[PDB]
Symmetry: D2
């Protein structure tokens, strides 16, 4: 039970909460889904504010006492101590303002608490003046995303490389086994089961390439572009220092865009990643369809392979064994195709020097990378490893 | 901590939890999203287990002493006491079995506790023999979904009607106000702002009608069709009783499907809805786009209307979030189409991702129409 | 080789051609697809102007001698005589202006040739002044399309009905044929093949139902809404009489829209049609995929049905006969899904009192309706009828 | 009128036609669209048959006298002599069998006409055995498509580089023109109009970049894979000698696939290209809308630019000039978005060692390429170049 001042009025924020009115206002405007932005987003949002204060202090804009406690409060956010304080819906108006401010206020209050000051006391440490210094919504939020995306994206590469490998092991394990090769679902010449499995592993290889390639256009950021991208009084030293600090703490080869308007209004580095992810899920779905057909039977199917039993067999009907792990892979592809349509749509919704539709674009981008990682990690383990011939 | 027995091995289910091995096995197979199924779906999933019990007691196949406590503990799930217990991922394999079984176990062990029995004792109360009696995955699950859809869907009709109304009032409020009508974004002739608003309000009317028509096909359910549709030993009396029970406890004019095979493999009743939803969000995204352009300025835009300030910079956040829900929906609909296309023979195993989105759409549309009418439409003014 | 005066310059119109400089400019602006607008649209686009002439004379705007020839010259276009003279791209800017002016020039110039005058001389008969009188692009063009769609939509209903019977015939023909009913592509409970074909029949019923209902919202036309919807000099006696002829000569129960601003700026009736078409071709694509699975083999398949062989693809492997007819269905399915996405994007693109993306919309809506009528026709005639149990 | 003998019956092919009974059977099975396959594909289909002959003569599998007349026949096809004789529908079952056989028959009956023989007499030159020797539908048809796409892609890149150029030119032209930079359609800071036309210029560069990288995976062909990908009597000399002939005449750095089984059944080269295309049209549509907003006016708009007039002022609203050329871009944009969804569905359809849905995939992929190149062409020439500030 507390009090905080907003232009709309005053909301009763709990004494526990590190978020303020600016976040509670977003709870009323956007009670759309209920979800919470991905933990890797929050981490990257923390990396951005820490990177900011470190740079702000170094150029003489931020008071070295107040900032020192913003850095420490930001490091706590990087480590995920405060994921229950980020309560704004991923789908939201204002083009990320609410997500940016939810970071600003949580780090603002927690920085006051460490230095022995009250929560909500914004005369001491303001979430706008001190935490959001030398930065807009339109560069913190993007850059955080760029970082969140890349990091998730690297996790996806490894988990996908590991999957690709385990297709090749199963490729040679069935080099000898011989099945009927089929075109138009209609019997052709006999074919080695191992060839089919190499065929899968070569396209997964080909995706891994495409996905990894989509990172390079994510390394260019616009931190310091501020409101539009002309700079609008944005110090060249601040840009350079916070860029280099963002590259350290995040760990990606991050840069500064050669045109900060271009990096602020265009959203093509995202459609690009989502496009590579769609084509990967096109392929895995086909393969998932193959696996389900080859596993068909026992008596009225193809009975070429046997998948690990991962769900209990029919009550009294014998031989009933559903291929649930491929099935779930088909469904994640259906999300990713959709996700990509929403992303395409939100990208087209660009107008002039900003695209205010980023929240849903980034929600679906992150979700795409996340569900793929997980199904690949669950599929390979509880299916690809155990797959045996008949 | 506890121990329960499954064909893979012996997992450790917390004693606080009412879910069993089947749910925790789902947790390892499908840690896809981390989401939970919608409360109204669980309620609906609880309206089916009650209707299933009452009928099997009415035809004598269920022990009336055990079934008595299956019913009452089901009603607890219908009133949302045990929403924490449903912990399977909406996107999942096995065409919904992990959701259905999650109800069976949570209902089973809470039934046990209400007749003073040990949790986990499936010799006393078996989730698959007792709770899942006369019913397969492929009718319990769909029928719950039908009910959960029609129910959620009714809140949307209402919330959209209200929204439609508040547009009609704004069309009256701007009946005299004059603005420049535009085609190709080029100046045409002046028209009345009220007309634009009535144009909007008339399509929202046309939408409400389109949405509402997609309920008809959704009333036809397949409870008692079991796994395929032929029935597989299915007692005709059971079907009749349980359907009538489901019509009472749901609140919808439900019917039993004429062709129980057709009601089990086809999934057009779901793509039909997504289409009515998509089309609504095509109309609303446009309108929102129109509203943002009208609110543009103050010095270098069109400056035709003034939206209530909701959030510090002032930006038109409410029409914006309308646009973004619209994009969500078109994408949800692509997913729903695919999942429906992927169908094979007597069962479309992709229903969970379809039923996850169809529900999501309905839910997020509802929620934004609410917020938008309230924190925007109502307070709109001319400049 | 002729000559005509446009604001850009002078182009040489062949003497054989009944179009003019307005059309040729559009041919130079939009060399995009190279396609021609669908004949039923050319037919319907003439029914519009014929009515517009009839009415404009009846209320005292057009000259009774000149309009006499516009009407008789429009009667020819309705019967298809000048399809060669509609050369403007279906994809075109100007919200369908060039399609409108193609009809106005085609008719005007033909009108002049009947009443012993020269083609090109618009002083006696103008496309803009006489043929396009009491109408802008934004009522003549949609109303044509409305009439086109409905006619092409009537054919699908009949062709889909006929198909739907022949599905039922086969489901009576397979009332006894036992086979394995499958779930998750696994074996379950033995079923009858007629029970499947009845399920195919019964959805296709539900498709015919859904598609039928889309017509209602199409019967509201916006003729006489002219430029915006306020009327802008719209004589109420013209609107009533023009609608009458339109409804009469077209066969449809066409109404007049209660709100001329609504019918001119909203496009939901199209997106409504489209989505019904998408749902239909989902079902069919599934029906296809099943058919092909049933028709697999001979020795490494399911071999549940034998489709009539309609072609050879057996140069490499002699004797192999594939399920081509279901295969083409799946493909026309995949078009309609795409077509639908365009129509969605196009609709959402509407700004204020006119939607300038209508042409690409209608191009896709008409194509969908046509390619469905066609492949349904050929699929029933060259596969469904001769299906036989194994 | 001619007589040719088929399984179904005996069709009456006109004597002046070069297509045979396989082609007319495809005309009756798939009367879907009426479109003809794109001329570059026709041409690319020819380059395939020439290189198939030349190699077959080099290893002595085909008769040198016959092959001589097959080569001369194909070379005429490559210059577009017989584009009229390719009457088959681009959407069709049999995984492209008809499109292949229509080449085989057009080429053979032309070859036979050159050497004095009668058309239809397949004893001398059999389209099936000779013209199509050592090559299946499943490598003849795609390798052509690869070549077709790669030829058509090299065009888009020029037309897009030349477009990007003219953006940069206007970007310098407006360097000192000041306008209001807007976020959320609300006023932000004043900005230079030239800075916007450089954000445009640059994204279009990043598009040229992505687009060109889709060419690599396209240079791997599968020629010699025949039916399944395991060769099936695929003479290693023939393979290599075919590849080099293809790379020669096409003018592409062509390679033989390391794994012909993978190459035959995976279809992710095309989805990768379509993915790029879409992203380009997202970026271009965004730009196209800005241009429509900037040119809005004259008295109740933004009036930031004037686009050259490309169509006459309206009949009802004298001197009203719409942004037609940017409108057609938006529409072609919307095409691709949907064409991609088709392509996506098509690839997904894939089952085992062949994707039978390639026909509607390549139709869309090629269209997207062609229609983009065409709207880019007319847009830079009839809009972007004459763009003037207010
Ligand atoms: Ca989605």
């Amino acid at each position: 039970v507390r009090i905080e001042k907003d232009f709309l009025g005053e909301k009763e924020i709990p004494k526990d909460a590190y978020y303020g009115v600016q976040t509670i206002r977003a709870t009323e405007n956007f009670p759309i889904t209920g979800y919470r932005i991905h933990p890797e987003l929050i981490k990257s949002l923390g990396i951005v504010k820490k990177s900011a204060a470190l740079a702000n202090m170094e150029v003489g804009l931020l008071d070295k006492e107040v900032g020192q406690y913003i850095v420490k409060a930001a490091d706590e956010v990087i480590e995920g101590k405060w994921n229950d304080q980020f309560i704004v819906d991923p789908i939201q108006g204002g083009a990320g303002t609410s997500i940016n401010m939810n970071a600003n206020e949580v780090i603002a209050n927690r920085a006051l608490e460490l230095m022995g000051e009250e929560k909500g006391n914004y005369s001491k440490i303001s979430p706008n003046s001190h935490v959001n210094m030398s930065q807009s919504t339109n560069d913190a939020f993007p850059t955080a995303t760029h970082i969140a995306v890349l990091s998730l994206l690297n996790q996806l590469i490894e988990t996908t490389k590991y999957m690709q490998q385990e297709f090749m092991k199963k490729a040679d394990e069935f080099a000898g086994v011989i099945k009927m090769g089929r075109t138009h679902l209609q019997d052709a010449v006999p074919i080695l089961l191992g060839q089919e499995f190499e065929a899968y592993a070569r396209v997964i290889a080909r995706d891994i390439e495409r996905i990894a390639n989509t990172r390079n256009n994510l390394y260019d950021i616009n931190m310091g572009a501020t409101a539009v991208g002309t700079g609008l009084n944005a110090d060249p030293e601040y840009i350079s220092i916070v860029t280099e600090h963002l590259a350290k703490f995040s760990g990606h080869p991050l840069r500064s865009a050669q045109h900060l308007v271009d990096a602020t209004q265009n959203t093509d580095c995202y459609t690009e990643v989502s496009s590579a992810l769609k084509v990967c899920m096109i392929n895995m779905s086909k393969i998932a369809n193959d696996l389900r057909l080859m596993a068909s039977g026992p008596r009225a199917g193809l009975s070429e392979i046997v998948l690990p039993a991962r769900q209990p067999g029919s009550s009294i009907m014998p031989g009933k064994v559903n291929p649930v792990m491929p099935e779930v892979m088909n469904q994640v592809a259906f999300q990713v195709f959709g996700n990509d349509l929403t992303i395409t749509s939100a990208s087209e919704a660009g107008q002039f020097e900003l695209n205010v539709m980023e929240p849903v674009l980034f929600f679906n981008l992150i979700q795409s990378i996340s569900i793929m990682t997980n199904v690949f990690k669950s599929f390979t383990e509880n299916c690809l490893k155990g797959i045996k011939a008949n």
